[PDB]
Design a protein around this ligand. Structure first.
Ligand SMILES: Cc1ncc(CO)c(CO)c1O
Ligand SMILES: [Ca+2]
Ligand SMILES: [Cl-]
Ligand SMILES: [Cl-]
Length: 223
């Protein structure tokens, strides 16, 4: 997160770190056995780390659980990042608590104007590179579909929304990928992509989770 704040230990109990020897992506716990992330975060031998603040220190609220199964969306296009969503089953259920907790799925899509919390261990600088150990937060509004398409011509499908500030300065960034965009207690977004970080007229692009609920529910019901 660029130009955000330190969330605070466990203040976002649904944030997970995807770990393959190292944090490489964010994720969101949606029940005791499943995480939602970005498809472009797919790789094998993932361990899900829940209850994390400092990802480089064991501080006492962690649960480390290996992924048993990953499922990229059937229609994921790695080239356009269309349908950038993925579900990961945990090898055992997480012990759900105040600091480790699922975030609800949307019943409807959110609108332009809605305030949302984006979070992740990604790079904190818009130029140059600095990775935080503790989780970083950003409050950002969903931007209109027309301004999103205008910022990114020929790239914004119906499965993406922009969130952030057109002035720049505040955005998600490298390492936030697959992480939560939570709006009014509901997971509305997954950190998908952007042109750099916090650049003017170049806000973050998010997977529109409301388009995927049916698939998420149907999938978790049979796996
Ligand atoms: C803005 C932005 N830029 C680049 C990346 C690379 O994944 C991400 C997520 O990893 C991101 O959110
Ligand atoms: Ca830790
Ligand atoms: Cl519009
Ligand atoms: Cl267009």
């Amino acid at each position: 997160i660029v130009g955000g704040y330190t969330c605070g230990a466990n203040t976002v109990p649904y944030q997970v770190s995807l770990n393959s020897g190292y944090h490489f992506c964010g994720g969101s716990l949606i029940n005791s056995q499943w995480v939602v992330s970005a498809a472009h975060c797919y790789k094998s031998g993932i361990q899900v780390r829940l209850g994390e603040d400092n990802i480089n220190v064991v501080e006492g609220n962690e649960q480390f659980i290996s992924a048993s199964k990953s499922i990229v969306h059937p229609s994921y296009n790695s080239n356009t990042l269309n349908n950038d969503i993925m579900l990961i089953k945990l090898k055992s259920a997480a012990s759900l608590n105040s600091r480790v907790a699922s975030i609800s799925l949307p019943t409807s899509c959110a609108s332009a104007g809605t305030q949302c919390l984006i979070s992740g261990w990604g790079n904190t600088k818009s130029s140059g590179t600095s990775y935080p150990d503790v989780l970083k937060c950003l409050k950002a509004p969903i931007l209109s579909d027309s301004s999103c398409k205008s910022a990114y011509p020929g790239q914004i499908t119906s499965n993406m929304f922009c969130a952030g500030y057109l002035e720049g300065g505040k955005d998600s960034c490298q390492g936030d990928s697959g992480g939560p965009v939570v709006c009014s207690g509901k997971l509305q977004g997954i950190v998908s992509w952007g042109s750099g970080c916090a650049q003017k007229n170049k806000p973050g692009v998010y997977t529109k989770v409301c388009n995927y609920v049916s698939w998420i529910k149907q999938t978790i019901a049979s796996n």
